[PDB]
């Protein structure tokens, strides 16, 4: 049990840094995709109403 | 789609939903409301079959939907009664069975020398209280190659769509299905008949039969996993992985209320981690010895979060 705790604590420590970087990368891709879809939907709605 | 006998609001609502999902660009809509004449609604089945026959005779596939078959029979009897003609049974014409059999016989799969096209016919029969032994109900069921019985008892409880496994059958068999879905669900037709007889034993007070506990628990999870929502169709790659985990006993240890969340979590993990197994079932359409061992190992490891 003590030998298995060494490999588990070493794996959980490296996974904490990767989990924080994965949350920041997913939030940046979601914000850029939502901002680009909002500009495309606003231009398409104004073009459909004018046509 | 050949909407015959429907109202004006029902035809406009169905055409608006297909255009928003990129589906109205390759679909023919035959508007035939009940506010027009009797000759327009009776000839809606023959006019829609002529437009779909041009693609089957060239080298393409077509799919006709005569909704509904009960409305076309009432429109033909109204024009024949006003033309000074003798009626038959149930105040209908003499050639009532010949009008529906001639329009459905043209939708057949052609050979290789005729172009290789085909035409699918989807005729809906509107019943009255589930009485399938009527005059217009028994005539259309003995001309088509199978029928899909839609009972009103299982539709109100939440099992959508209410498709009775003991009543609805297909005359084509396993030849009209893909090889990937037939391998993982080869005993799906036999498991529905065994689970129906074991479900009624729980309301009698019997709590024994340790060997029948695995079949009764797997039958309840398989019925909830096959029930999909409206406008949520699945492909052949996502339906082959869901049917293999419910027939092999991998979904017996999960809960009944978590059957809806387990379908979305299994399809999302197979598209980002083991994406090679999902693309092989859709391109090849079957599973060999290497595809069966990789699908069984991924489903067992995904059950423990």
């Amino acid at each position: 049990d003590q030998v298995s705790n060494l490999k588990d604590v070493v794996s959980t420590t490296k996974a904490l840094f990767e989990m924080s970087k994965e949350t920041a990368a997913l939030e940046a891709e979601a914000f850029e995709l939502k901002q680009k879809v909002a500009v495309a939907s606003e231009a398409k709605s104004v073009l459909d109403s004018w046509v | 789609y050949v909407a015959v006998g429907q109202k004006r609001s029902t035809v406009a609502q169905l055409v608006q939903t297909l255009e928003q999902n990129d589906a109205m660009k390759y679909s023919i809509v035959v508007a035939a409301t009940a506010s027009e004449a009797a000759p327009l609604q009776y000839l809606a089945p023959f006019t829609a079959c002529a437009i779909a026959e041009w693609f089957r005779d060239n080298g393409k596939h077509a799919l006709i939907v005569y909704d509904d078959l009960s409305k076309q029979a009432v429109a033909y009897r109204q024009l024949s009664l006003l033309l000074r003609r003798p009626p038959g049974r149930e105040a209908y014409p003499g050639d009532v069975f010949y009008l529906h059999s001639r329009l459905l016989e043209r939708a057949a799969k052609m050979s290789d020398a005729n172009g290789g096209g085909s035409l699918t016919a989807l005729p809906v029969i509107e019943t009255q209280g589930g009485d399938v032994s009527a005059y217009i109900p028994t005539n259309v069921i003995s001309i088509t190659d199978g029928q899909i019985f839609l009972e009103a008892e299982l539709f109100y409880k939440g099992i959508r769509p209410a498709i009775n496994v003991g009543l609805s059958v297909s005359r084509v068999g396993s030849a009209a299905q893909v090889k990937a879905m037939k391998q993982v669900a080869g005993s799906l037709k036999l498991f529905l008949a065994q689970y129906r007889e074991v479900a009624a034993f729980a309301q009698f007070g019997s709590d024994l039969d340790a060997s029948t506990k695995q079949t009764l628990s797997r039958g309840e999870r398989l019925t909830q996993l096959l029930k999909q929502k409206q406008y949520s169709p699945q492909a052949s790659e996502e339906q082959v992985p869901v049917i293999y985990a419910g027939v092999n006993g991998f979904l017996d240890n999960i809960p009944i209320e978590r059957i809806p969340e387990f379908e979305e979590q299994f399809i999302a993990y197979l598209k980002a981690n083991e994406g090679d197994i999902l693309e092989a079932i859709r391109t090849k359409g079957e599973l060999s010895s290497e595809l069966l061992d990789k699908l069984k190992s991924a489903t067992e490891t995904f059950v423990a979060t």
């Binding site: - | 008892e153 409880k157 939440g158 309301q203 007070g205």
Partner: protein, 116 residues
């Protein structure tokens, strides 16, 4: 579920499933009796009788034929009252406390006055 929400769709399917099970088993309850059922069928028969009487509310125009006042339950109050009775929170109350009433507030007040 796309017009009434996920909470209102689950309450409508659960109330309709309990009434369909009691109606199909009416041939054994009217001939053999209610004692011929099992443990799961006995609890579903008692909940189906109280859910059928709770949905019948007295209208304002029918006050001279019924004698009670008019009850107008809202859409949010009717969904919360049906979900609490199907979970087991009102199983100790009687079947006459929900007949000709409103929501969950009128069912608790009618049971306390009849037991006094």
């Amino acid at each position: 579920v796309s017009v009434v929400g996920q909470e209102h769709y689950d309450v409508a399917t659960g109330v309709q499933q309990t009434l369909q099970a009691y109606k199909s088993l009416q041939d054994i309850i009217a001939i053999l009796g209610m004692d011929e059922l099992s443990e799961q069928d006995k609890l579903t028969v008692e909940r189906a009788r109280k859910i059928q009487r709770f949905l019948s509310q007295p209208f304002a125009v029918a006050e001279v034929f019924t004698g009670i006042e008019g009850k107008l339950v809202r859409l949010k109050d009717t969904i919360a009252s049906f979900k609490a009775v199907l979970e087991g929170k009102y199983d100790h109350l009687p079947e006459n406390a929900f007949y000709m009433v409103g929501g969950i507030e009128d069912v608790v007040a009618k049971a306390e006055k009849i037991a006094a």
